[model samples]
Target: ISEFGITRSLIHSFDPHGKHYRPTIKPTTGFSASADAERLHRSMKGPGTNELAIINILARRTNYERQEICQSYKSLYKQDLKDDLKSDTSGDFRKVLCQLIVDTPYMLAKSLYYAMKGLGTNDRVLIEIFTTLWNDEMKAVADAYKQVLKDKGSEESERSLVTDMKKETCGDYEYALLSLVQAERDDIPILQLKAIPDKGVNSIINHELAEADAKDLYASGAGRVGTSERRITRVICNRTPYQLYLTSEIYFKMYGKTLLEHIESETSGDYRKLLVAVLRYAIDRPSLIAEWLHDSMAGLGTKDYALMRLLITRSEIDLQDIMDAYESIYGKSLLNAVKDDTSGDYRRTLCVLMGEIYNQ
Candidate 1:
């Protein structure tokens, strides 16, 4: 029917938790290294090498393996992989991958704080990292955020960022009104402290106490596309599973619908479905990969690229749930769908992904 012909059949065969098959490592000529070092080195230089690839290599490697990989990269490339990445990529993408390579949880947290700081908000960057990939390292990042804030005094930094956001509209035109609204809210600590009189600070204290009683409510659910609800979702997705559950509950209670429902309503096609699946994985089980397979193949034919992105990005952490959701929603085997929808190298790559056998 289509140029791409799918061929795979069963679902269990695509389990992503099987033993990892390491790529054959050839000896690095013009380099003095052992077989292990050579193997690690060749893996680093594998086809389709990219920043994400580098992170994957690091993530899958053991400490000793990591050392060997790093050594291999240095021997072959004559430069540190992380440093090269820093020079190659810029902004949030650079920040995310580099932090992963170094495994510096603190730096990632600081990067987030900086993203939220200053005049213009890097909301998209924040949203991307938190929503797309931060689930795996949320605890470390949260700890780092707290540590950084404490180091600089939480009240002061919070006040400064809020003030900047208010004054300059955070470099966003649409946020001007929203920023004003947030700034004027009685619940804002800065607003309360600023209202305090020089002699009778008790007035400010009383105002805050009374304001607390009022409980200015912010709507939850899936916020409008341009609003902060998505941002909140992004941030909340990175927290612990229990926190994700709580946030979802509160979000739904505050708004009128479940978070996933809201997203489904707001977005369309595979993008929305993928995001919903990701949210589900975040709040519950992280190993579901079926949903991914179904969404990639079922709807208006297959979107192989999108499927690749989801599998490559999520397989290491939460693909099992994706599989379960796919099976539940489609009533068909994931691998079978792939076989029906894709062909050739595309099918092969997806089949490899669906197999869920890659360690990294």
Candidate 2:
């Protein structure tokens, strides 16, 4: 069973202005898994692979639809779609296609495992993934994480996300990230939310609570000589997104420095990054992702792993807004950025995933 009672506040936050938050990708019209499977088969049937056909069909479909295509491929061809794709494609091109076909939560769990399993952690990656996820997604990640651990020969006690995270992280950073995977953000409960219209919910944001939280957060840190990391983590981790929004505004009014600025000065290392990330998400998740995407592409030599993961993962989440934010912030379109940063079929697959082009 899915985790119960966690608020789905992130869903509402995505499109706070009333219209549905646009994903860069949506399900293709007139979808047919069998037909798509045959197309994929034909793409790989002859001497050379038709990379364009594969990118067009696979990139356009939702991950759920891609799974159906996998099923259809197996039934019709008597061969595994994944195995065929692996044989047909190579390097980053293959990686993007496989990532598209895998179940999202499972893929995310695998990425998490990859991040932590190495000698050191990818702290920014952990922050980005955890901060962007909805509470329900977090639970799904936990379940998928357990399965991943078991597949890799973990014992019963070592199988949970909690156990692995505790082992990999330490100090207040661990406490903050652990709270996210724990999946207990205090969004207003669904039953209570039903009575409040989407616009109405923001009206009812607890002003007094935000004020108190803003005060307590300061007392826990810069207000005192030293800091109380638990107090900072608990407040940042447990509050509803709207509550944090209000608290941060109040924080700026009372403290003169933005909460994000305070985090930069008062905390150091991974702990600081996690805290700032949570605040940025509270303020604007898609915009935060947009900045991250820019980071991956801007420097000398692209971070393909981070670039590919963000495109495939957030494609269906908030990539449209990410693109919009990208244009507004950087004066360049994300597609152009992708086009310039990558090459060959890898670039084509990413462009398709960006949901703007599919030249078949």
Candidate 3:
């Protein structure tokens, strides 16, 4: 798990009076043109905007603030911010940053889809995007895809673009894409299922699963048998629901079997089911969580590790889906189940985990 450091000094600065904390003040030193010019020069001539810089700025700014920055960049440069970004970099790095600057999340989503669905998958780009950006931005990216598809005619290329994106953006993204398409076409569900060619589906599944295995090999420590397993375990245990879904699709495509099936076959009992549920929640629907909970714990004497793992790991990203799934599948509230089955530190941790805590 990554720790976001919030210093006591920073906290104290915001809470000087101590009734209700006030927002921290940033000293403006009166906007110097020279300073702005220097900053711009560095931005243009330095390493160029990488994913970390893009995400770091995004973390500090709200959408409104980002919009203001975009407007300011145009006002200052007389050139489109995206065009300026293009002038600064090239290839995938350029592609990612330019899209971020243009605020064309949809276009980037389409590009990523194309890259993944093309004859060869661009695994590095997928990993970078998935690991770095926020779920909401990712949602915006998916929305951008829908917007593009709607504005542009659905050509074979466009259809392939959509398929590729759908293949990559699993979990919340998948749900968002489904919602967007369904909003446009009442028969989208049937259309989607029917439209997926067998070879494409197989290609998607095999390519992704194989990628997972490769990642496992890279992360495996010192040739240990369980190193890959532990690495994957840590990832599943720590990754956001949205990430798990996207990566799992990639994992499945590479291996020919779903990640859930792989984990289940590799492990046993409650442990297997728990991991399976998390992957299922990531790949399929949140409602499956509820179904999983009911099936995993209905008659068992104690809470299963597998069930706990799924519930804990996915609570942040897929809680809503899990809630919806739970209600739909078991006709009960997930909260009620938590209350009945868990308590003390465990219950507290689960509560905090499920809430809408932002990932930096």
Candidate 4:
């Protein structure tokens, strides 16, 4: 992988300590599924593939629409869309396009499987993947993960991603991930969301148990020595975004500090980052994803897995917001950052994946 070369954007760090970014991809209106499906085929068919055709058509569509094109491509051509794309192309461009052809939940499942499959566990990756996922997305990922294991051909029958996780992770982190994986679920889970729509969450000031939770958070950490990492982890883990919003205030009201500030003071290293990440996602999803992209590009070398996971997963969802936020906070375009941070085929692929806004 290093053969592709290390990326070096401007200052040369992907640190996402605090900031927001806008997304690069958006839904293209008035698109034709059949026309897109045919053009994609003609581009990849013949002796050599027309990659720009692949990029131009695929990059402009929505995630749901891409899934339709991929399915339509298969139905019309009698072959897998991804199989065609991968065979025609190689390296990061091909890898990025594979994500384009699939929907978010499966895309997420594939990334998590890659993070876990090899030698050790990537707990940061595990936490980030589960952190923002809806209950139904978890179920879809669970099924996808099972297929990943089966593809790996593990001798242990019924070897679950959950079981694999049990082997690699322990304590509160494991508990946090598992809760989401096994939670009550649905594609939209319409029931769990009630209609007091907190747009920007305005202010989630009125949860009945807000003070009680905040009181416990203070008693658990600031009032005590070291930090009750477990208690802190638990409160954040089980609560919804709105509950988290309420607790943010309660934490300040009782302890004179935000929960994020409290966590930073009490904990250090990856655990602290994970907790803070959760706080950001609960408060503002666009900001959290932008930060993830930054974190991936930071320091001496890129975290390749993190880079692909953040960009591909959010590209369809909120990458335009992430792109804007990255620019707003970093004083540079995430596009330029990707260009500087990576090299060769991979860099080209990432830049294309970044979309039209950055391309110019």
Each candidate's TM vs. the true structure?
Answer: 0.38, 0.85, 0.30, 0.80
Score residue 116 of candidate 2 by CA lDDT: 86
Q: CA lDDT, every prediction?
A: 0.42, 0.76, 0.43, 0.65
> Per-residue lDDT of 113-225 in model 1, one digit per residue for the tens?
76666567654334333443322244445555666677666755343323332343333322422322232221214343333333223332233322222222233332444
Candidate 2, residues 281-342, lDDT tens digits: the string is 76766688888998888533333478887888677656888899999998999999988988
A best-first ranking of the candidates according to their TM-score comes to 2, 4, 1, 3
lDDT minimum window of 10 residues, candidate 3? 1-10
Which sections of candidate 4 miss by over 4 Å? 1-23, 155-157, 167-169, 184-206, 222-230, 284-287, 298-303, 343-348, 357-360
Prediction 2 TM-score vs. true: 0.85
Candidate order (lDDT): 2, 4, 3, 1
User: Residue 234 in model 4: shift from native, Å?
Assistant: 2.8
lDDT by residue (tens digit), candidate 3, 165-272: 443234333333333323221111323333334222332223444465447724433454532244544455344443455566666666676666666666554344
Q: Give the better candidate number (2 or 4) by TM-score.
A: 2
Where does the lowest 10-residue lDDT sum fall in candidate 2?
1-10
Q: After superposition, how far is residue 50 of candidate 1 from its true place, in Å?
A: 21
Tens-place lDDT per residue, model 4, 283-331, is 6566677777888886433336678667765665557777888888788
Off by over 4 Å in 1: 1-130, 135-241, 249-281, 284-293, 296-304, 343-346, 354-360
Q: Where does candidate 4 have its weakest 10-residue lDDT segment?
A: 3-12
Clash number for every model? 23, 0, 23, 23
Candidate 2: Cα lDDT at 210? 83
Of candidates 3 and 1, the better by lDDT: 3
